[PDB]
Symmetry: C2
Subunit: 295 residues, 2 copies
């Protein structure tokens, strides 16, 4: 079983230091109504590092409850740099109705390839729901090698692919050339189309928070092999895809959602904070050429 | 400022049947004290802080404080986090358990901006009254505390007295001490302990000192006494072991070396950390043959 297509790494809106549960639910329904195939609660874009275990439960339960009765899947973030914790978060995400888990590579402690294998093997054997690996070396300080990804894909039934955020289209070829049955997912919006055109089967997008219809159309154009139309949308989105990373994700996207009136307060949890006034103006200017769907 | 400097050891955390070997933990700390170490760093990066429970962090810090009582050895407890509310709690938690100061690593993974790093450490410094040492290791965190950010935190926050640098950037070490010579630059990379000390650094937080505490202590104290010839002499002799202790990610090689030297009973890690490859196991054993390793 797999979870693919156009997917959104959901932001986590805050109101006076607390999770805005009403805004969280209405933001997910806005994603559902704009053709998004799955939502990723408490991911990296959702500020998972600063959320309590209770708040992660609430965000996952809201996502599951909002997506019931639709095709939209819930791919909950449940990674950790401690394997015993990552196993607990995986079991915790399943108990709350998630269709699958996105489990980031252990950050900071830099496990070896052997350790990465044993880390994910313990996670996969703890649940019966699909597990999508998440490789983002710029954040974690380590890399899940192609061989390690392929071994985990072949040895673990529920591990069905990887979300790549590594700016390495060479590795994307390497992955799908040696194991074309895995689901390569783009975790980097600017290169959504090149990953999809090489056989990638979906994206986990940051831009889709603001422009879910455009990311969805891009993905489904690519899945129907209409690469001209898929590339066109990807080219159209390049400016917004880069300006959403002038500061660290999710600082720009939350700023954009606030500027569009899609979230009610521009609140982060430290060490995340508001962007500079120069980047605030940059985001506000680039957004003006994109039509932002309302509620 | 209240400072904690000198030769310091990032203590490994020995495991036995998946649990912290507390008796071994105390014995290893005593071995560090008896070999001239000026401070010990419990539940740091080398101590596998990522996989220790909150209670296990308490036990390790208290054991270090208890073992160091009656000596001049300070306890600089690791108490960092990528969530500011948690890092504040861990800083206060470290103070409650008798730590002399805290080593607070830059928030990992979520890559805060320099403005966010400033507010992150400012909240930590205003939560306790013990010294706070910054820890910049961009290869692990994915972010860098800029020289300007470190200097602002040093000047604006009373308890922040310096930074443990593990960035392979001797240029930044010059940049730091040239613009703020009052701060305590601490070497977080054993191979370049002497270059950092010779530029005005006032201590090291060492991985090699777990295995060779007498050599790291003599190196550091030679440099602090401005005997740079003897300090460099030790640094050059230590280069081979300093590099092989990172043939795999810290603390995989150092724990392997401690096991090979008979200093710990079992070569146990907590996943996602694991034993090294058998080739690197032999390479570490090969390099150790050059060095005299103190017992207990
Ligand atoms: Mg069709």
């Amino acid at each position: 079983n797999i979870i693919i297509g156009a997917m959104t790494a959901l932001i986590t809106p805050f109101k006076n230091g607390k999770v805005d549960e009403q805004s969280y639910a209405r933001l997910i329904k806005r994603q559902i109504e704009n053709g998004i195939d799955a939502v990723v609660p408490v991911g990296t874009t959702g500020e998972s590092a600063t959320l309590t275990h209770e708040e992660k439960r609430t965000c996952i339960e809201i996502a599951v409850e909002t997506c019931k009765g639709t095709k939209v899947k819930v791919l909950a973030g449940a990674g950790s740099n401690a394997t015993h914790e990552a196993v607990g978060l995986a079991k915790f995400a399943k108990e709350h109705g998630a269709d699958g888990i996105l489990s980031v590579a252990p950050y900071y402690n830099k496990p070896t390839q052997q350790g990465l294998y044993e880390h994910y093997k313990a996670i996969a054997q703890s649940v019966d729901i699909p597990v999508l690996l998440y490789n983002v070396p710029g954040r974690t300080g380590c890399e899940i090698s192609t061989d390690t990804i392929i071994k985990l894909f072949r040895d673990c039934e529920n591990i069905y692919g990887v979300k790549e955020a590594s700016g390495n289209i060479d590795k994307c070829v390497d992955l799908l050339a040696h194991e074309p049955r895995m689901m390569l997912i783009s975790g980097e919006d600017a290169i959504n189309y090149p990953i999809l055109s090489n056989g990638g089967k979906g994206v986990i997008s940051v831009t889709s928070n603001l422009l879910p219809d455009m990311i969805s159309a891009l993905t489904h154009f690519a899945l129907d092999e209409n690469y001209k139309e898929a590339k066109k949308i990807n080219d159209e989105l390049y400016n917004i895809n880069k300006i959403l990373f002038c500061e660290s994700n999710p600082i720009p996207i939350k700023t954009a959602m606030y500027l569009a009136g899609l979230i009610e307060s521009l609140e982060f949890r430290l060490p995340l904070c508001s962007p500079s006034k120069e980047n605030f103006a940059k985001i506000e200017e680039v957004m003006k050429k994109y039509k932002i769907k309302g509620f």
